[PDB]
Amino acid sequence: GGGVAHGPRGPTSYYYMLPMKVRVQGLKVALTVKLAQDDLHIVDSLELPTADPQYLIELARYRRWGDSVLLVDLEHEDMPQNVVAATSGLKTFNLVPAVGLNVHSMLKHQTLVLTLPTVAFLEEKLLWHNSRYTPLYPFRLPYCDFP
Amino acid sequence: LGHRYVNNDKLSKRVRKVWKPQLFQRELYSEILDKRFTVTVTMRTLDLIDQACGFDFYILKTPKEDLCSKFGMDLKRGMLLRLARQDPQLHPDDPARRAAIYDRYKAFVIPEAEAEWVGLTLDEAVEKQRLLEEKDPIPLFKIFVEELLGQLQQQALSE
Amino acid sequence: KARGNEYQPSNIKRKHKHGWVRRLRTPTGVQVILRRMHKGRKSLSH
Amino acid sequence: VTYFSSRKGKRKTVKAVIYRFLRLHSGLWLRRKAGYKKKLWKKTAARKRRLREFVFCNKTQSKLLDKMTTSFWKRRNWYADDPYQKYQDRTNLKV
Amino acid sequence: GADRMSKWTSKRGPRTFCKGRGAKGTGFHGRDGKFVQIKEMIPELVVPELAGFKLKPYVNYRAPEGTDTPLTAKQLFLETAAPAIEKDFKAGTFDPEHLEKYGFEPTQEGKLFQLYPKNFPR
Amino acid sequence: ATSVSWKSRTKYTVMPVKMRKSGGRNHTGQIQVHGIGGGHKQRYRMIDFLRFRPEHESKPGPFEEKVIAVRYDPCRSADIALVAGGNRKRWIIATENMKAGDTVLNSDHIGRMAVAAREGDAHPLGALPVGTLINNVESEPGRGAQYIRAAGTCGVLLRKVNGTAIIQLPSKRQMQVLETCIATVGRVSNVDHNKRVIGKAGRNRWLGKRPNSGLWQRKGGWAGRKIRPLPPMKSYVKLP
RNA sequence: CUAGCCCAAUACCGGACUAAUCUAUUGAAACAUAGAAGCAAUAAUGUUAAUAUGAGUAACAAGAAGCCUUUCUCCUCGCACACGCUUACAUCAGUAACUAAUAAUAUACUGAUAAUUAACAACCAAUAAACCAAAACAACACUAAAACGUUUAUUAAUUACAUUGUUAACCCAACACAGGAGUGCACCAAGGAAAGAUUAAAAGAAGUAAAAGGAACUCGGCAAACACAAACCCCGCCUGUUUACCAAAAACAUCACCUCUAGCAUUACUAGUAUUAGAGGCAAUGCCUGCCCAGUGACACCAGUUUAACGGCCGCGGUAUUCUGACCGUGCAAAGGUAGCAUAAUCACUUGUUCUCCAAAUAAGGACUUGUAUGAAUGGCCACACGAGGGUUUUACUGUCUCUUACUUCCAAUCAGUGAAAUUAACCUUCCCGUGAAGAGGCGGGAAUAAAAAAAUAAGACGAGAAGACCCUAUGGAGCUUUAAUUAACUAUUCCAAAAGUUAAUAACUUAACAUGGACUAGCAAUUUCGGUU
RNA sequence: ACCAAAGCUAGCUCAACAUACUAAACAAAUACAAAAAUACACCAAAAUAAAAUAAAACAUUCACCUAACAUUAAAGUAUAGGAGAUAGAAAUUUUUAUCCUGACGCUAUAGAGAUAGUACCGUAAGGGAAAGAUGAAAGAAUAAAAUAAAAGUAAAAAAAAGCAAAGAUUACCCCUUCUACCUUUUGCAUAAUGGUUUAACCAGAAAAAAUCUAACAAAGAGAACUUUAGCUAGAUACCCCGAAACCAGACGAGCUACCCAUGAGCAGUUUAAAAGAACCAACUCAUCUAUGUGGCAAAAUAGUGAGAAGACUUGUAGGUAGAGGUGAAAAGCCUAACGAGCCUGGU
Ligand SMILES: Nc1nc2c(ncn2[C@@H]2O[C@H](COP(=O)(O)O)[C@@H](O)[C@H]2O)c(=O)[nH]1
Ligand SMILES: *C(=O)[C@H](CCSC)NC=O
Ligand SMILES: [Mg+2]
Ligand SMILES: [Mg+2]
Ligand SMILES: [Mg+2]
Ligand SMILES: [Mg+2]
Ligand SMILES: [Mg+2]
Ligand SMILES: [Mg+2]
Ligand SMILES: [Mg+2]
Ligand SMILES: [Mg+2]
Ligand SMILES: [Mg+2]
Ligand SMILES: [Mg+2]
Ligand SMILES: [Mg+2]
Ligand SMILES: [Mg+2]
Ligand SMILES: [Mg+2]
Ligand SMILES: [Mg+2]
Ligand SMILES: [Mg+2]
Ligand SMILES: [Mg+2]
Ligand SMILES: [Mg+2]
Ligand SMILES: [Mg+2]
Ligand SMILES: [Mg+2]
Ligand SMILES: [Mg+2]
Ligand SMILES: [Mg+2]
Ligand SMILES: [Mg+2]
Ligand SMILES: [Mg+2]
Ligand SMILES: [Mg+2]
Ligand SMILES: [Mg+2]
Ligand SMILES: [Mg+2]
Ligand SMILES: [Mg+2]
Ligand SMILES: [Mg+2]
Ligand SMILES: [Mg+2]
Ligand SMILES: [Mg+2]
Ligand SMILES: [Mg+2]
Ligand SMILES: [Mg+2]
Ligand SMILES: [Mg+2]
Numbered sequence A: 001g002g003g004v005a006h007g008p009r010g011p012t013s014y015y016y017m018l019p020m021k022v023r024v025q026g027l028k029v030a031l032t033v034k035l036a037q038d039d040l041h042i043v044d045s046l047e048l049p050t051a052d053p054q055y056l057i058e059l060a061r062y063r064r065w066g067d068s069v070l071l072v073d074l075e076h077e078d079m080p081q082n083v084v085a086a087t088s089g090l091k092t093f094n095l096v097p098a099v100g101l102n103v104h105s106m107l108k109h110q111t112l113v114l115t116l117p118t119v120a121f122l123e124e125k126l127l128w129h130n131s132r133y134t135p136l137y138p139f140r141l142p143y144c145d146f147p
Numbered sequence B: 001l002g003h004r005y006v007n008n009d010k011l012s013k014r015v016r017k018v019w020k021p022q023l024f025q026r027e028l029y030s031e032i033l034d035k036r037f038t039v040t041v042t043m044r045t046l047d048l049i050d051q052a053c054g055f056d057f058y059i060l061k062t063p064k065e066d067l068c069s070k071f072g073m074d075l076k077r078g079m080l081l082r083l084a085r086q087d088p089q090l091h092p093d094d095p096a097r098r099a100a101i102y103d104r105y106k107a108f109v110i111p112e113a114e115a116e117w118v119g120l121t122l123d124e125a126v127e128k129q130r131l132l133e134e135k136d137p138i139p140l141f142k143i144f145v146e147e148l149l150g151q152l153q154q155q156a157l158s159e
Numbered sequence C: 001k002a003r004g005n006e007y008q009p010s011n012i013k014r015k016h017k018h019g020w021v022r023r024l025r026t027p028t029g030v031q032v033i034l035r036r037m038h039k040g041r042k043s044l045s046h
Numbered sequence D: 001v002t003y004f005s006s007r008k009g010k011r012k013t014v015k016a017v018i019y020r021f022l023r024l025h026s027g028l029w030l031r032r033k034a035g036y037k038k039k040l041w042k043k044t045a046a047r048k049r050r051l052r053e054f055v056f057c058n059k060t061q062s063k064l065l066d067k068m069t070t071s072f073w074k075r076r077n078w079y080a081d082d083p084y085q086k087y088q089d090r091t092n093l094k095v
Numbered sequence E: 001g002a003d004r005m006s007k008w009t010s011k012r013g014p015r016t017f018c019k020g021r022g023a024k025g026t027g028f029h030g031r032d033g034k035f036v037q038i039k040e041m042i043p044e045l046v047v048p049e050l051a052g053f054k055l056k057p058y059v060n061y062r063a064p065e066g067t068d069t070p071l072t073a074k075q076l077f078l079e080t081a082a083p084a085i086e087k088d089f090k091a092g093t094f095d096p097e098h099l100e101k102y103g104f105e106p107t108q109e110g111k112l113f114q115l116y117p118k119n120f121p122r
Numbered sequence F: 001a002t003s004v005s006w007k008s009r010t011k012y013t014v015m016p017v018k019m020r021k022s023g024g025r026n027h028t029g030q031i032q033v034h035g036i037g038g039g040h041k042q043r044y045r046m047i048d049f050l051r052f053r054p055e056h057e058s059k060p061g062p063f064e065e066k067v068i069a070v071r072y073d074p075c076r077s078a079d080i081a082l083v084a085g086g087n088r089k090r091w092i093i094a095t096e097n098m099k100a101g102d103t104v105l106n107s108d109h110i111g112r113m114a115v116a117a118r119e120g121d122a123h124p125l126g127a128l129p130v131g132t133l134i135n136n137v138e139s140e141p142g143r144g145a146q147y148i149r150a151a152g153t154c155g156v157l158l159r160k161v162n163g164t165a166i167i168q169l170p171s172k173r174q175m176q177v178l179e180t181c182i183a184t185v186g187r188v189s190n191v192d193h194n195k196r197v198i199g200k201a202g203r204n205r206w207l208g209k210r211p212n213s214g215l216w217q218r219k220g221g222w223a224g225r226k227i228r229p230l231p232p233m234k235s236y237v238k239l240p
Numbered sequence G: 001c002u003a004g005c006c007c008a009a010u011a012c013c014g015g016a017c018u019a020a021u022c023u024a025u026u027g028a029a030a031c032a033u034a035g036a037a038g039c040a041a042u043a044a045u046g047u048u049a050a051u052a053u054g055a056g057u058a059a060c061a062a063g064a065a066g067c068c069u070u071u072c073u074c075c076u077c078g079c080a081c082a083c084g085c086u087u088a089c090a091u092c093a094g095u096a097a098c099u100a101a102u103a104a105u106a107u108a109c110u111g112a113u114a115a116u117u118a119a120c121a122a123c124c125a126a127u128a129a130a131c132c133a134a135a136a137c138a139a140c141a142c143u144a145a146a147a148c149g150u151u152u153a154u155u156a157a158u159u160a161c162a163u164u165g166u167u168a169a170c171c172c173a174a175c176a177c178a179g180g181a182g183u184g185c186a187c188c189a190a191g192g193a194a195a196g197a198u199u200a201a202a203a204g205a206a207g208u209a210a211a212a213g214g215a216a217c218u219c220g221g222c223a224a225a226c227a228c229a230a231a232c233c234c235c236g237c238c239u240g241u242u243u244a245c246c247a248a249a250a251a252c253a254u255c256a257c258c259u260c261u262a263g264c265a266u267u268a269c270u271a272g273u274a275u276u277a278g279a280g281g282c283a284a285u286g287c288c289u290g291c292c293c294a295g296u297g298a299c300a301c302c303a304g305u306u307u308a309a310c311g312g313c314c315g316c317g318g319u320a321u322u323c324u325g326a327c328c329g330u331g332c333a334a335a336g337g338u339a340g341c342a343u344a345a346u347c348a349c350u351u352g353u354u355c356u357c358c359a360a361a362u363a364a365g366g367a368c369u370u371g372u373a374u375g376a377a378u379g380g381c382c383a384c385a386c387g388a389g390g391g392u393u394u395u396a397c398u399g400u401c402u403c404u405u406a407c408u409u410c411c412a413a414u415c416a417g418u419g420a421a422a423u424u425a426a427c428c429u430u431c432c433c434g435u436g437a438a439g440a441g442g443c444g445g446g447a448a449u450a451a452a453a454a455a456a457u458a459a460g461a462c463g464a465g466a467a468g469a470c471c472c473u474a475u476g477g478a479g480c481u482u483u484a485a486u487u488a489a490c491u492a493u494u495c496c497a498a499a500a501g502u503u504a505a506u507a508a509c510u511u512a513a514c515a516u517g518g519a520c521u522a523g524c525a526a527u528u529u530c531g532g533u534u
Numbered sequence H: 001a002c003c004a005a006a007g008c009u010a011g012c013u014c015a016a017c018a019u020a021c022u023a024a025a026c027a028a029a030u031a032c033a034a035a036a037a038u039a040c041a042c043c044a045a046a047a048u049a050a051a052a053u054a055a056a057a058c059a060u061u062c063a064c065c066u067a068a069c070a071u072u073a074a075a076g077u078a079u080a081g082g083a084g085a086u087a088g089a090a091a092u093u094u095u096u097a098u099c100c101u102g103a104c105g106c107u108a109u110a111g112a113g114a115u116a117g118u119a120c121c122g123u124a125a126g127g128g129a130a131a132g133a134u135g136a137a138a139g140a141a142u143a144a145a146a147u148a149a150a151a152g153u154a155a156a157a158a159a160a161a162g163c164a165a166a167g168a169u170u171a172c173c174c175c176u177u178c179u180a181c182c183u184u185u186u187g188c189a190u191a192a193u194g195g196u197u198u199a200a201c202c203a204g205a206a207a208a209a210a211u212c213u214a215a216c217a218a219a220g221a222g223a224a225c226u227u228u229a230g231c232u233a234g235a236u237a238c239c240c241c242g243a244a245a246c247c248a249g250a251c252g253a254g255c256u257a258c259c260c261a262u263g264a265g266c267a268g269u270u271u272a273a274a275a276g277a278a279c280c281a282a283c284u285c286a287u288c289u290a291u292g293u294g295g296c297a298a299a300a301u302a303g304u305g306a307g308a309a310g311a312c313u314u315g316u317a318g319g320u321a322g323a324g325g326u327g328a329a330a331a332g333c334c335u336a337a338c339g340a341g342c343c344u345g346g347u
């Protein structure tokens, strides 16, 4: 009934931050491979005729998108209620806003769906780090050309 | 209570040392309370008294943190209550002397609502508040009679 | 000579040395009772 | 050496080495010769000059001093009128 | 060693340890060492007359029960004093200073069986 | 636990009272004096050391008492004597030749003529001749005879100057006191007390003397015949 | 040579794979790529649990017959109370198994039901006064001076029956333990059973008896004995106390004799007062205790005094023919070891020399005696009585021995029941010589060699037991002592300051009880240490 | 074939939030010797932390060490230190409200000690366990199915010779060859240590400088810094058990050492004697021998001894407590181990 020699000791936090440019390049590589492997589809306005999830199921089966679909919208409050109710009842069809795009989800879902404003937003957000300075103070603070 | 270095050298032995004050049994007379207290006071106490130009002056001027004495706080509370009440028991045969004594201590006049809570500890204050709030439970007969009288007055006025 | 029988029972000595009153009459015995209560002993004293 | 402090959990440095040594930015450590102030009437002028001259440390002693000092003493210092600013760097080192 | 979990009764001690078993005292010690028992300290069982009492330990099984209405102070007041005080106020002779006529008791120390000190066992 | 003393008796009585011995133990319970304990059961006979003590304050003059019996006392080395005068009896320390059926005088009057000193008589030092043997002398008037009491021991009056008497104690030391201090004349009873021979180691245990420790201790500088001069005269008069 | 996957390894170092889990994605007859770790046990006298060896071995028990609880054969710790344990007590029923160290059955296990009834015991007045005069058959006394009581006056609710302890075969020792247990009665009128059943090996324990001798045994007459006596020394006067659990003494204490320290009051000493009380030394008594204050202590705060205070009491050379030295010369000391005893319990030489004791003695006793290291209250010499103290003689006595023997009981062996321990790497576990980490069952060279039980002996397994207690090491401890190094607190001195004051026209002087700050001298003491090569 | 083996649950652990924090029960009795209705009082107390350790010793020093100011930097900087080991700020800066909380934590030698602070062990403080497994239904036990897999035995004792095996062989041995394994050593078969065996637990941990990989590059980093190819991120690294001891606070004088109260015993014989006299019982000690030595016994039995009216034995109750007590000094005894008790904490 004795103690443990080494064992696990307390809550251990496995926390580290990859460089911001490394994370941005990872996002770029994820988008590039999703496009090059015929697994990225650009849509317009993410509009749906009905809120039937079986409609999206049959549409993906007809278009041969695959088993898993990740639809990325521009904003959260600007999502149409049709697609919201159609994705709230599905598991393999996941609806995420633009700020919720990630390498893990892009690799988990076989097919990526991007709207035109989402594509423009992603391009504008990702191309900014190619010709930017090192942050004198955090970018949340007022800069000359940055919000 | 502390430590010290014998021979005043750091590299020498460290020794526990208790420095104690020189106590003296002196008799101090108060003008407001009119009584001579045989108290154990120190030369610093006598010096503070001479600096304040009076025993009552010293008591009324030095606060609790500078007195550090429950008896001193009790003396202050007593003389403050006497000054706030204008006690005729100071000099029942010398009203002029009583008034002359009460005038020279006018700068420390505190109202009665606060003059009886200065020299009290937390336990004493809780005990005083309990004695003040100690009320016997009124019988429910009185409450029911008052309710019935209210209902009867309402039925009498609603006609 | 022969050892082991060092305990000669007597209720007077028992209750006078390890009794409830003996424990409560001293501040150290009160601490003993408090420690036994914190551990949760079924019997705090004799 | 305190590898993990108790207050901040950081690595501390020994003050004796910073009191009797000087680190150039190129990794070299500068020191004084031991005994350059003891019994100067008993020593020859050549020996006294040898004692007064500064000297460098070898690789083992340099690594020891680097282990005993923190990273604050291995920084680039731009002092006003620093005599060792010309020696802070290394030139023509063909290794 | 001795036992600690068992109860410390009078059977487990010397001759000089004679602890009572919970009975109440009935007197004191007299002059010659004997015990003088006081007849006022012994409980007098007040037994009624059960001759013409037509009530049994059990009730009829077909008899109906009633909804649980625990008797409260407000209900007792409404039953004993509300009609009297109401009639007195309607007649106009109500006296708020004297409430002894309705059954209120100012001080319990006068009567025999007081309520707060609980002078009676049962 | 802290023990209580057996000396809780305010009323003076002639009958012997029981006393609880304690072997070197203070009121705490630890040994303070070694070699004490386990003696014979003894009673205490209360002795009246203030010899001149009138019965009533109405007649504070000198008084005469009669000796009833000279008895043995286990508490002190001397013999006690019961003396009765008026309505009370009292135990005093018997002198050398005090027998049953004697008269003892107790006086506080000092006159220009010295009085003839008998044995049982007790007069102030100012009224005794210049070469009188005394015992049970006092330090202050009315304090009580703390000084010489042991069996056979007696002091001697040396001189009286400026209303102050000088005595010499059995320790050959001079003691100056007021002349109004009462003192009993003669030697204390049991003059052969020093010549007694403890026959065996058991008589010491009977007396209540535990054996000495067996630890061998090397003598220090304290040992050796220290021929010290006689200390100065101990004076008890308060000179203003 | 033919094929290859193509050259040994301890400490440390480098690399490639990889078992089993969890997670993210695959997979879905149990896997892959990645990320994580409580990530792998032939070894710590490792922890827990279970199993074996020793081993069915050591050890343990119930007197006989009978008509079945009635008679015989034996030994005698029984009854009650106090203290303690709490129902283990009583009746009925059951025991395959659990408790009895085994059965029979049962006061000791199981279940149900009942029980110990107060007169005995516990709880069961204060306040003042009269009271000195022991218990011991108490007549009367001794010393060690001794517990135990009435009367008088004032108040003590007043009225049946209060409450509590009442069993036992029992308590403390891990146990149904050959142990430890207070008191009053008797020695049986009350308690019990040494043998489970056989045989009569060895060895072991207990007893009885023994020819002739009678200590010849042995360190010693230990033990035993049909004896149970008389003497001589050493050490302690004696009775007594001590290392519970290896030492009972010559150790300690002790009466006696000596030193120091104290002139005094409400908790020790002491309700005492120098014929007293403490701190000590040495040991009754008898004869004595010689010299020394140079050093260190203690009084004296410096001189000076103290050794029944700590302790010390001398060299070198010649001398009365040939041996010694009464004597002398010279030197140092504070005095230079006196009396006494002496080969001793007394450094070695020593088994000194001599006489008695024996046939023989390093034993014992008496003498001689520088013991150049005896010696006088850290006491020296004798003596009575005493001592489970240590030695030596004389008879008596005997199995101690010459030299063992016989028979009983417990053991032992067999049968039946129950059933441990240290120990154990695995053994299918010979002898000789040699070799070898220097003493071999395991190696080498030879001999021997069907396999298993049972009973004996202890030569070896460098046998078991206890991480050698001897020795050394450790920049490991602890106890003790100080002339070790740093110095506290506290207790006794002294001084200065503070405080209280007093005198005189800025000065001098005193401190009852406390009591603050800083110094001084001592007790009691605190922390730490004991260089290395050999 | 026995012994046995396997379940998945009881529950625990770490955090977040949080009302704001000594749960429920409290009829009577409970600090008389706790659970005992009931009489003229006394009640309360404080005075620094120490040491084990590091400085390879140890004397000044030795972070945390049961006292709030948290976070990002300044910064391990100024400073403090036998200026050694080590200790260590501040001025000045940063910190956006709520839900989104569960688990790359364990599954009965694990996770809390816990079925429980209970049995049990100690006088006491205190220490402190192990133990559960069928099924929808056992109101389905002439009860049904899966493993019959550890060590230990039975079925089934053995036949010259040998670290027990290997080369083999028609063939189990017979033939030939090899001095068990770890640890420690110059060197072990060594007769140097450790282990009967089985099962389950049981022992390497940190990123300063460096190497590899990658991002960006005279600039790097999501704020504070580093930069004469550098800056950022990731991966590569440093065990387990064991003293005598030291300090602090509790608990211990029911054994024993000594005292204080209160009681009790000593019969017979010789003696003008109760004479610390003599013989010898009860009683108290323990001289010598023999058994016993895991025994009846962690100190006993038998024989034999000493005292036995005393400085005697002994019952009950109380006191003296560890830097201490007590001691007719044995450095004895203080609850079976005392050159200084035991328990807890430092650990
Ligand atoms: N110092 C040192 N020890 C060695 C060396 N070689 C072997 N040893 C030591 O020798 C022992 C093993 O012996 P080996 O296996 O080399 O015969 C080990 O103690 C090992 O450390 C060496 O080269 N140097
Ligand atoms: C001497 O040889 C030794 C005696 C030690 S007893 C102090 N014997 C065994 O080690
Ligand atoms: Mg655990
Ligand atoms: Mg025990
Ligand atoms: Mg118990
Ligand atoms: Mg009782
Ligand atoms: Mg009883
Ligand atoms: Mg009655
Ligand atoms: Mg006396
Ligand atoms: Mg006398
Ligand atoms: Mg003496
Ligand atoms: Mg002595
Ligand atoms: Mg080759
Ligand atoms: Mg190799
Ligand atoms: Mg993997
Ligand atoms: Mg592991
Ligand atoms: Mg294993
Ligand atoms: Mg062993
Ligand atoms: Mg073993
Ligand atoms: Mg193991
Ligand atoms: Mg067997
Ligand atoms: Mg058998
Ligand atoms: Mg055998
Ligand atoms: Mg047998
Ligand atoms: Mg019991
Ligand atoms: Mg049985
Ligand atoms: Mg039964
Ligand atoms: Mg009975
Ligand atoms: Mg037989
Ligand atoms: Mg039998
Ligand atoms: Mg038999
Ligand atoms: Mg035989
Ligand atoms: Mg025989
Ligand atoms: Mg015989
Ligand atoms: Mg014969």
Ligand SMILES: [Mg+2]
Binding pocket: none
């Ligand atoms: Mg012989």
Ligand SMILES: [Mg+2]
Binding pocket: none
């Ligand atoms: Mg011979």
Ligand SMILES: [Mg+2]
Binding pocket: none
């Ligand atoms: Mg004999």
Ligand SMILES: [Mg+2]
Binding pocket: none
């Ligand atoms: Mg004989």
Ligand SMILES: [Mg+2]
Binding pocket: G227, G228, G229
């Ligand atoms: Mg004889």
Ligand SMILES: [Mg+2]
Binding pocket: G236
């Ligand atoms: Mg003797």
Ligand SMILES: [Mg+2]
Binding pocket: G238, G385
């Ligand atoms: Mg004699």
Ligand SMILES: [Mg+2]
Binding pocket: G241
């Ligand atoms: Mg003794």
Ligand SMILES: [Mg+2]
Binding pocket: G243
């Ligand atoms: Mg012994």
Ligand SMILES: [Mg+2]
Binding pocket: none
């Ligand atoms: Mg003894």
Ligand SMILES: [Mg+2]
Binding pocket: none
């Ligand atoms: Mg012995």
Ligand SMILES: [Mg+2]
Binding pocket: G248
């Ligand atoms: Mg003896």
Ligand SMILES: [Mg+2]
Binding pocket: none
């Ligand atoms: Mg002696």
Ligand SMILES: [Mg+2]
Binding pocket: G257
């Ligand atoms: Mg003499």
Ligand SMILES: [Mg+2]
Binding pocket: none
């Ligand atoms: Mg002696």
Ligand SMILES: [Mg+2]
Binding pocket: none
């Ligand atoms: Mg003598």
